[PDB]
């Protein structure tokens, strides 16, 4: 009995009227709830009996549902309201949560500032070397970092409360086998805020 939440990611601005969807693959008899979750915190109940507001929830939140279709509406988005939103059904077991909808603050495209940091000498003295690519303050969040002439891992920040942008730290890590490819190491950065891919390097 699957609950599909749509869309997964939504971009919006303060004052935007916004609608979020939950489809159930089979009828639930209005046994449906909506939650809000801000990162680091636990969820709050917004809606139960799929149209009824919990005490303490702002009128700008509204919901309706009929059968297999459920919607949550914010009449005007407030800064407090950018968070992730979950649906849950009580119809039968298991009581299931939707996948989520993350609502992010929409801004103008901004290109990342790219940086590359070669390994530390101190890190080298430990017998292991890591090269880092830093993408500072970009938007939107979809971006591509490529290492090669190896296996790497990327990590992204949250959205900045001040600037509403994202940042990315990619780490290419080779100790194992000074890579079977050993000359020049680099990271090509692709983002739609840039003319064409930006590249940074050393040695």
């Amino acid at each position: 009995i699957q609950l599909t939440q749509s869309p997964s990611f939504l971009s919006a601005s303060v004052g935007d009227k916004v609608t979020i969807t939950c489809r159930a693959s089979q009828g639930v008899r209005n046994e449906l709830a909506w939650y809000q979750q801000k990162p680091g915190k636990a969820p709050n109940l917004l809606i139960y009996y799929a149209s009824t507001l919990q005490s303490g929830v702002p009128s700008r939140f509204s919901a309706t549902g009929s059968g297999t279709h459920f919607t949550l509406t914010v009449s005007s988005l407030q800064p407090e309201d950018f968070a992730t939103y979950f649906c849950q059904h009580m119809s039968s077991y298991p009581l299931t949560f939707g996948g989520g909808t993350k609502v992010e603050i929409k801004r103008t495209v901004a290109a990342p500032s790219v940086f590359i940091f070669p390994p530390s000498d101190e890190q080298l003295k430990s017998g292991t070397a890591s090269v880092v690519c830093l993408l500072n303050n970009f938007y939107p969040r979809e971006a591509k970092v490529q290492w090669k002439v190896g296996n790497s891992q990327e990590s992204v920040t949250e959205q900045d409360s001040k600037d509403s942008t994202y940042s990315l730290s990619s780490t290419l890590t080779l100790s194992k086998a000074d890579y079977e490819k050993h000359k020049v190491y680099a990271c090509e950065v692709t983002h739609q805020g840039l003319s064409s891919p930006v590249t940074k390097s050393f040695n």
Binding site: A42, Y48, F97, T157
Partner: protein, 217 residues
């Protein structure tokens, strides 16, 4: 009206963990209690719920015969036992009270603060903090690389908290080695590299490791 859960757990694969939830400020036997978990970066999974009055339990089929909920009326407390632990079980576990309008699941009302549970073979280790050195020689970037520590979390501050405006602290990453690494960074004008001396404060309480380290070009 509050639910206070127990502290963070670290466990080897194949082990078992008991998490507790104590209720305050409302009568315990009046509301069903769900258990819900969230793995990092992922959404909510319902494990099951218990009636603290009757002691009735419904466990989600996926977890049946592995997960168990119990309760103690005396101490107004609910228990969750997860057994035969696996990497898949890493995440935060919440207890949450149902409004239980009409003796039915209606919605989750009061939530616990959550209990972090980590499952790995790995052993407690302090981090290695490495400089991320500034270049040329316009605008530049500085940082720390906090590598191979277990378990989470750590704290990272720049100028020992003095400037929070430029700092970007990236979430850690679980490595193939089974230990965590993150990066911390700051952006500054590039005339400042000769002048100002850059603080780095890192606290990993699990290893009881406090580290201060400085980054210049």
């Amino acid at each position: 009206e509050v639910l206070v859960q127990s502290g963070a757990e670290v466990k080897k694969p194949g082990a078992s963990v008991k998490v507790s939830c104590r209720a305050f400020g409302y009568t315990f036997t009046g509301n069903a209690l769900h258990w819900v978990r969230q793995a990092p970066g992922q959404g909510l999974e319902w494990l099951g719920w218990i009636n603290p009055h009757s002691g009735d339990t419904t466990t989600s089929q996926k977890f049946q015969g592995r997960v168990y909920m119990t309760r103690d009326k005396s101490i107004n407390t609910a228990f969750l036992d997860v057994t035969r632990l696996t990497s898949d079980d890493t995440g935060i576990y919440y207890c949450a009270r149902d409004k239980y309008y009409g003796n039915e699941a209606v919605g989750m009302d009061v939530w616990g603060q959550g209990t972090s549970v980590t499952v790995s073979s790995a052993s407690t280790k302090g981090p290695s903090v490495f400089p991320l050195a500034p270049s040329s020689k316009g605008t530049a970037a500085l940082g720390c690389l906090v590598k191979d520590y277990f378990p989470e979390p750590v704290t990272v501050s720049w100028n020992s908290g003095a400037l929070t405006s430029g700092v970007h602290t990236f979430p850690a990453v679980l490595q193939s080695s089974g230990l965590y690494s993150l990066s911390s960074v700051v952006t500054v004008p590039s005339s400042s590299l000769g002048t100002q001396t850059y603080i780095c404060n890192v606290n990993h309480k699990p290893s009881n490791t406090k580290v201060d380290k400085k980054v210049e070009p």
